[PDB]
Design a protein around this ligand. Structure first.
Ligand SMILES: NS(=O)(=O)c1ccc(Cc2ccc(C(=O)NO)cc2)cc1
Ligand SMILES: [Zn+2]
Length: 255
């Protein structure tokens, strides 16, 4: 199989006698296929930055094992050559402490695996607008990736109401260093949606939020280049192309 970097893929396997699914060390969780009772699914994701050239997964059954090979593609993402160089940014201690603390808080959440669906059918978009900046835009020195846009931006004047893309539980609902006012929602099975740069937050940590319910108003918090909504999806432990993942998830779970 082939997969473009920064994308997720739904793998399908026989349910009967299945014991586990592995990638070296790492176990990969599985969930039911919602339409076919003889199948199970797993989500597999390639990082954007520095992915392997190929990946070999193994599914262990009682009777036998099944090898899955996946080749990484580069895709056709927009990229610009960086001119300066990263050097390294030297922020003041107070900011470095804040960033490092927020990072830890995020990793703990992103590696919680909720083994049931908290969603309700298909994802919807968080507002009815259009994309102003795409997933995957890269900056390169030495044709190696220095940075990339890890979500997608939708046009929004400050104050545009923003709606949950699907049901779940809120896990983050506060001002954070680069993200501004942030909401992150757990949808189950390790799928998280992300809403950044809000001017207002209307939900609370631990709250159960239904699809289409209001979660805030858009703003420009944390942003240099003007107001906009940044929407992200993290799944299989990585940031992935949100519109790509939404169309693949919906093809399977549309009620
Ligand atoms: N540790 S932290 O402060 O919570 C933290 C660090 C990095 C990021 C990634 C990120 C941020 C903003 C944007 C963006 O809006 N593009 O328009 C995209 C990605 C998110 C949160
Ligand atoms: Zn963005």
């Amino acid at each position: 199989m082939e997969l473009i970097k920064g994308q997720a893929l739904f793998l399908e396997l026989d349910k009967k006698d299945f014991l586990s699914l592995k990638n070296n060390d790492k176990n990969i969780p599985t969930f039911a296929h919602p339409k076919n009772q003889e199948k199970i699914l797993a989500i597999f994701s390639l990082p954007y930055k520095n992915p392997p050239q190929n990946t070999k997964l193994i599914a262990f059954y009682k009777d036998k094992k099944e090898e899955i090979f996946i080749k990484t593609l580069e895709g056709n993402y927009k990229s610009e050559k960086l001119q300066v160089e990263n050097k390294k940014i030297f922020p003041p201690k107070t900011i470095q402490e804040r960033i490092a603390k927020e990072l830890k808080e995020a990793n703990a959440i992103y590696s919680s695996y909720t083994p049931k669906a908290l969603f309700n059918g298909a994802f919807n978009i968080p507002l009815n607008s259009f994309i102003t900046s795409d997933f995957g835009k890269a900056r390169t020195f030495n044709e190696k990736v220095a940075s990339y846009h890890s979500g997608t931006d939708f046009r929004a004047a400050t104050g545009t109401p923003i709606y949950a893309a699907n049901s779940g539980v809120v896990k983050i609902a506060k001002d954070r260093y680069f993200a501004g006012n942030s909401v992150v929602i757990d949808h189950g099975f390790g799928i998280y949606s992300q809403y950044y740069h809000l001017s207002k937050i209307d939900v609370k940590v631990g709250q159960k939020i239904k699809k289409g319910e209001l979660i805030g108003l858009s703003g420009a918090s944390g942003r240099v280049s003007g107001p906009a909504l940044h929407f992200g999806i993290l799944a299989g432990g990585k940031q992935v192309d949100p519109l790509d993942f939404v169309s693949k998830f919906n093809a399977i779970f549309q009620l």
